[PDB]
DNA sequence: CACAGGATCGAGAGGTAATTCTGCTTATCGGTAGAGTG
RNA sequence: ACAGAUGUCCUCGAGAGGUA
DNA sequence: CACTCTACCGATAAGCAGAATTACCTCTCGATCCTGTG
């Protein structure tokens, strides 16, 4: 489900680093910037492979100041929440609002009107969990979640999951 | 023949008092005014009625009529003219703006 | 598109190109940037730029755009400065 | 020099333009790092440009005149 | 209003009335005042014939 | 030339020396050259944007009035020679001040 | 940040299509036959969950040997995997990269296949069909028992009606995953 | 080159001094492309 | 469309790349036709008739009368065409029809030419002036917008409560006139809208048109800072590329200098001198962006200038500046000189320089412009 | 004792000279070949 | 429980008189 | 062979619209009533 793409990022290098090691400076800048970025269009850039392969081009010096802009051409693993598929995740939190299922670097939220009526909130057990007949989900449990959220990609992406229909349980 | 006669008339007008003007300027003027198959007068109905940029044409005369026509039609301003860059406050692609300057890695690693 | 090395522009540096490189180098030296020549007791960025250009030690690339859209890259060191 | 005198020496303005609209109807929240265009539902295609305030006034008046001066940062020749 | 603004007429229709009929007296030297007090104007609203000196 | 305008009935401007506390939006020029009546006595050298006439007008807590003084022209300087005070047609205050300078 | 040139009137297409639904209908940017950096016409990869773990581990060890030799020149089961992953991540990437730990843990504790030969067998088996790489990725990532369960969990699979070869390669995937 | 030519043509026009029409009116009628000039002429050899 | 591809002249007109010329040809060719056709003979076998799908109704003679269109129907009926029916007809126009006419499918459709929703400019477009003390006034745009809103409300109420058709007509005419005057107050053959005082209402078209409009008076040419103007004078002792700048003008004008090695001592000395002496600085721009005023703060403090900071020092000797005279007939009317500070308040230049400037010393005044960046200085020096 | 909001200007006329050279549009005339005969 | 003041530039359209 | 209007373009003749060098300095005024009210 993870995708390998050919994204590109523009870095405006300062003339103060216009030495023989500006290439490595751009390399470390790309690492420290792109990793952990929750871009709305793409998602999470988990890691960049072929570090000793990524190539830079001739940097265009802006008319305004001496800073040069470089258009790097890198490829990396991208994770997108997407919409309209099933996916397996592990719970990390629970409350009256719902359970915070975690899939990779994500936290998909399930609201009250999403899961079927076969789940009731209670705190009798050691972990606060939704307990009912033939359903047992806890703080740490297996759960299959179907995503139908609107993502709402604004400098960060999100996901909303559903528990309706069978196969969306522990199994 | 019309272009040659127009150049001769312009030269006669210019040289009537005694001043001297280089041939290149008058030749460029007469070539611009006769680029099409006929005379293109330097007026509102002449050069200002071509397929150039809407902003450049509107900057001379009849500002809102030209803009209204551009809005009614589908006019795309590719914007490499000087007037468009002046309006947008960008470095016009003329003189020193006709080229871009880039920095190469090999020269950096060779000079240092 | 780039015209390989079958370029057909002029092997010399125009006045506008000279002015643009001189200004860019002057700005770069005015800011904290490395200098690839022996200052030798000069402290004005523009004069440092001319001193660098004297023996073609400026790592700048000229991109001459053809009217169609193509462009060919000319190195500063390979451009003859006669003006 | 002409560009500097026209923009730096007189008036410089920074505005955000929607990548789909081409207009300047973009709500920018620098503190919250939010740039949403309500017209197109665009939140990842916002660019910032530097134009004189006179150009901003002219574009706003043209938009008030039911004319759209859409601005784009790319060439359509590649189709 | 007519004597102050110089527009010969009422407050309304001022744009259709003559302007410059009344002017502030120039008091910088005696000759300037004397010349100003003996000045005439020709309302023309491009043509060189009316401006030429006739016999 | 300065004048007092009667806005409404009781909102009338007055010629007096303003203060940084009661009044609001004072000019950047100095006010020490003014007097109790708000007019500078003749024979006092002035320069820059110094205030020559001190006038204040009520807005409508405190701060019931705002400064409305007319400063001297920035590019001109000289010595005040004659100060004229009288009343206009309606009966308010009318103040005229003259500045004399020599141009070598 | 983009990888495809503007085409088909991107400026004012308005709502070209609704966002991707269950029945395929891919997005504008994640369409098939992506533009390759050096050339053109590069198809979308077929990357599954187990393949992702191996790929990221290979990239990590490659970068590990890389900066290890650079600095040299300058000068059980799940439990064992977690410690190795932690000690590899402690200094290789550097910085903060908090999200990398969570996805690595998800890959380790949900690794359907833990051998290069296993993933090679599964994608050599899956390359026979002409299914969208998205469908084969979900098929090889999440284990399934019944054909209807696969159809419901992974939509846009209606092109297979026989379900005989589908049962065959489902059993193949099941035994390959149990052979871990 | 266009601006240079325009200025090099306009400067003598401003410096121009005061029966065949010549001077500023003739230049204006040439630039405007007048369909009916004041003083048409012919030359036959 | 009245004509179709069956006509040869229609085909020739449609085979035009230019949109304006094609539209003009279409209009000229279809103006003569005055009746819709249900069948047209084919190009081959003219006796045979091929249906084209027309309606057959006769066309009206559209004539412009003020802000309304009147159509004469001849079989004569003289009816006034309404905006609603015209909009309905425009909405029924096929895509190909206005594509060939000249309109755009997505960017500019013909049915959008009728104003149904009127945007209001923001307060920055039409600000409120200060007026005098305790007085507030509004721009003409605000008053015109209020008038338009009042007319719209009156029309809505008059339609809702029930009223004669004549009242509806007069209300809609008033609304149309107000909108037209909002967008154009110089319509010929019609009264010009007056303000409450009596002046004509300044429409946005007037603001966007003319020498003083926001095209030529604010975009083509504007007002800039770092400029000076005073009476010029002659100086035989000055070199050709030298201009005598008065001390006061040099003190007023400033040039930003980046705090860097090779001039840190000089910059610190200039800062210590202060803005009162001619060699000195007026502001010290920090890296963050905050501005330090050396005049107000003073304190004679030993401010440490970190690298990368900007210091706005006074213009010194051998500083390139732009020297211009109006009118600027040719390129020699504005040239770059070298600053030489002189102890008198008048511009001094070489006598041989006056000839290209076409200036004398009988009272002429000439402008001076100071570059504010290194690249601009280099361009002026080398060009 | 005292305040308030909408519109000039009217049958009647005309409150009135100083500019022209394009171009566009709308009347106007001035022509010229046919639908079939004695 | 708590809580009484300040932020720097205002005209705007016109008219008239002049300087190169 | 020209009999009467029918369809075509080629001249002519009146009505609109725009637009008029650049820069600068100073002063001086005006930004509203009355019929209709408690
Ligand atoms: Mg003179
Ligand atoms: Zn938008
Ligand atoms: Zn029809």
UniProtKB/Swiss-Prot annotation, chain A:
Molecular-function annotations in GO: single-stranded DNA binding; single-stranded RNA binding; translation initiation factor binding
> Which UniProt keywords are present, listed alphabetically?
Cytoplasm, DNA-directed RNA polymerase, Nucleus, Transcription
Question: From its record, what is one biological process in GO terms?
Answer: positive regulation of nuclear-transcribed mRNA poly(A) tail shortening
Where mainly found?
Answer: nucleus
Pfam families xref list: S1, SHS2_Rpb7-N
Q: Which interval of the chain is the signal sequence?
A: none
For this record, an example GO cellular component is: nucleus
* Gene3D superfamilies given in the database record: Nucleic acid-binding proteins, RNA polymerase Rpb7-like, N-terminal domain
Q: Which SMART domains match?
A: S1
Subcellular location field: Nucleus; Cytoplasm; Cytoplasm, P-body
Q: List the disulfide bonds.
A: none
What do we know about how this protein assembles, alone or with others? Answer: Component of the RNA polymerase II (Pol II) complex consisting of 12 subunits. RPB4 and RPB7 form a subcomplex that protrudes from the 10-subunit Pol II core complex. The RPB4-RPB7 subcomplex probably associates with TFG1. Interacts with NRD1 and PAT1.
Q: Which family does it belong to?
A: Belongs to the eukaryotic RPB7/RPC8 RNA polymerase subunit family.
What does the miscellaneous comment read?
Answer: Present with 6420 molecules/cell in log phase SD medium.
Can you name this protein? DNA-directed RNA polymerase II subunit RPB7
The record lists the organism as Saccharomyces cerevisiae (strain ATCC 204508 / S288c) (Baker's yeast)
* Gene name of the encoded protein: RPB7
Curated annotation (Swiss-Prot), chain C:
Q: Where in the cell is it found?
A: Cytoplasm; Nucleus
Query: Which keywords has UniProt assigned to this entry?
Result: Cytoplasm, DNA-directed RNA polymerase, Nucleus, Phosphoprotein, Ribosome biogenesis, Transcription
Q: Which GO terms describe its biological process?
A: nucleolar large rRNA transcription by RNA polymerase I; ribosome biogenesis; RNA-templated transcription; termination of RNA polymerase I transcription; termination of RNA polymerase III transcription; transcription by RNA polymerase I; transcription by RNA polymerase II; transcription by RNA polymerase III
Q: Could you state one GO cellular component term attached to this entry? A: RNA polymerase II, core complex
Leucine-zipper: region residues = 39-60
Q: Which domain of life is it from?
A: Eukaryota
GO function terms (MF aspect): DNA binding; DNA-directed RNA polymerase activity
**Family per record:** Belongs to the archaeal Rpo6/eukaryotic RPB6 RNA polymerase subunit family.
Share any extra remarks: Present with 6090 molecules/cell in log phase SD medium.
- What is the protein's quaternary organization? Component of the RNA polymerase I (Pol I), RNA polymerase II (Pol II) and RNA polymerase III (Pol III) complexes. Component of the RNA polymerase I (Pol I) complex consisting of 14 subunits: RPA135, RPA190, RPC40, RPA14, RPB5, RPO26, RPA43, RPB8, RPA12, RPB10, RPC19, RPC10, RPA49 and RPA34. The complex is composed of a horseshoe-shaped core containing ten subunits (RPA135, RPA190, RPB5, RPO26, RPB8, RPB10, RPC10, RPA12, RPC19 and RPC40) where RPA135 and RPA190 form the DNA-binding cleft.
Q: What is this protein called?
A: DNA-directed RNA polymerases I, II, and III subunit RPABC2
Q: According to the record, which residues of the full protein are present here?
A: 73 to 155 of 155
Swiss-Prot record, chain D:
Q: What is the lineage of its organism?
A: Eukaryota, Fungi, Dikarya, Ascomycota, Saccharomycotina
ZnF region ranges: C4-type: 18-40
**What role does this protein play?**
DNA-dependent RNA polymerase catalyzes the transcription of DNA into RNA using the four ribonucleoside triphosphates as substrates. Second largest component of RNA polymerases II which synthesizes mRNA precursors and many functional non-coding RNAs. Proposed to contribute to the polymerase catalytic activity and forms the polymerase active center together with the largest subunit. Pol II is the central component of the basal RNA polymerase II transcription machinery.
State what protein this is by name: DNA-directed RNA polymerase II subunit RPB2
Which organism's genome codes for this protein? Answer: Saccharomyces cerevisiae (strain ATCC 204508 / S288c)
Its UniProt miscellaneous note says:
The binding of ribonucleoside triphosphate to the RNA polymerase II transcribing complex probably involves a two-step mechanism. The initial binding seems to occur at the entry (E) site and involves a magnesium ion coordinated by three conserved aspartate residues of the two largest RNA Pol II subunits.
The family annotation for this protein states: Belongs to the RNA polymerase beta chain family.
What range of the parent protein does this fragment cover? 1146 to 1224 of 1224
Q: Which domain of life is it from?
A: Eukaryota
User: Any idea which positions bind Zn(2+)?
Assistant: 18, 21, 37, 40
Q: Where in the cell is it found?
A: Nucleus
Residues crossing the lipid bilayer are none
Q: How does it assemble?
A: Component of the RNA polymerase II (Pol II) complex consisting of 12 subunits.
Coiled-coil stretches are none
Curated annotation (Swiss-Prot), chain F:
What else is noted?
The binding of ribonucleoside triphosphate to the RNA polymerase II transcribing complex probably involves a two-step mechanism. The initial binding seems to occur at the entry (E) site and involves a magnesium ion coordinated by three conserved aspartate residues of the two largest RNA Pol II subunits.
Q: Mark the residues carrying the PTM Phosphoserine.
A: 60
How it assembles, according to the record, is: Component of the RNA polymerase II (Pol II) complex consisting of 12 subunits.
Superkingdom classification of source: Eukaryota
Query: What is the protein named?
Result: DNA-directed RNA polymerase II subunit RPB2
Q: What is the lineage of its organism?
A: Eukaryota, Fungi, Dikarya, Ascomycota, Saccharomycotina
| Reported function | DNA-dependent RNA polymerase catalyzes the transcription of DNA into RNA using the four ribonucleoside triphosphates as substrates. Second largest component of RNA polymerases II which synthesizes mRNA precursors and many functional non-coding RNAs. Proposed to contribute to the polymerase catalytic activity and forms the polymerase active center together with the largest subunit. Pol II is the central component of the basal RNA polymerase II transcription machinery.
Which family is this sequence assigned to? Belongs to the RNA polymerase beta chain family.
Where does the record say this protein resides?
Answer: Nucleus
